[PDB]
Design a protein around this ligand. Structure first.
Ligand code: CL
Ligand code: CL
Lengths: 114, 114
DNA sequence: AACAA
DNA sequence: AACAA
């Protein structure tokens, strides 16, 4: 089963302009009912560049706690609906506390917090 | 200026699987601070198929009220970060009341309503 | 297992 | 100015 908070490897290419491209981890952010029934999921891109602009839609995840290659950043300004066929290996899954930070960053990203 | 609630024509192709494809209207759902400063926006796809599965992430918009070709549906389960270069003509913009419905549907889509 | 408030 | 809870 695909669950919200799961992290999968996925290929985001091809892309245009400053849409996040390439093969990378992505975190599932769609609700679990959609994750059960739909052929598609919604994800946010993850990157290993810790020197990006300091944007309020960024959430850090630590290499130690998760089975990561390096300290990474979830980009809640870089969100895609992907067909499940794009999802390859499940790499890890985020903690409840970390997902609360993701939820907050999504509220900001999408202007839902008024 | 690109504003949240604006509707633009955009080309979503190429896509994979059941990711929404093709040239179609899209609604800006990213916050207005990002819309000012970022080269990218976040959008939801719009479709003219009023016979889709009845999903709680769907929000109807009426042909009369907006300058539309036909009664349409906003698919809050089909959301993309797009480079602004993808945005062509501004077709219309949604009312405050309609955007409240969009906000609610996004909360559902992304499981933010617990 | 990129670049760009 | 598609298909698929
Ligand atoms: Cl390009
Ligand atoms: Cl395909």
């Amino acid at each position: 089963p695909i669950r919200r908070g799961d992290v999968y490897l996925a290929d985001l290419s091809p892309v245009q302009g400053s849409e996040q491209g390439g093969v990378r981890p992505v975190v599932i952010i769609q609700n679990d009912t959609g994750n059960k029934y739909s052929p598609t999921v919604i994800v946010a891109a993850i990157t290993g560049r810790i020197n990006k602009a300091k944007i309020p839609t960024h959430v850090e995840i630590e290499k130690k706690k998760y089975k990561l290659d390096k300290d990474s950043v979830i980009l809640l300004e870089q969100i895609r609906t992907l067909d499940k066929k794009r999802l390859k290996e499940k790499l890890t899954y985020l903690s409840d506390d970390k997902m609360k930070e993701v939820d907050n960053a999504l509220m900001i990203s999408l202007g839902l917090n008024a």
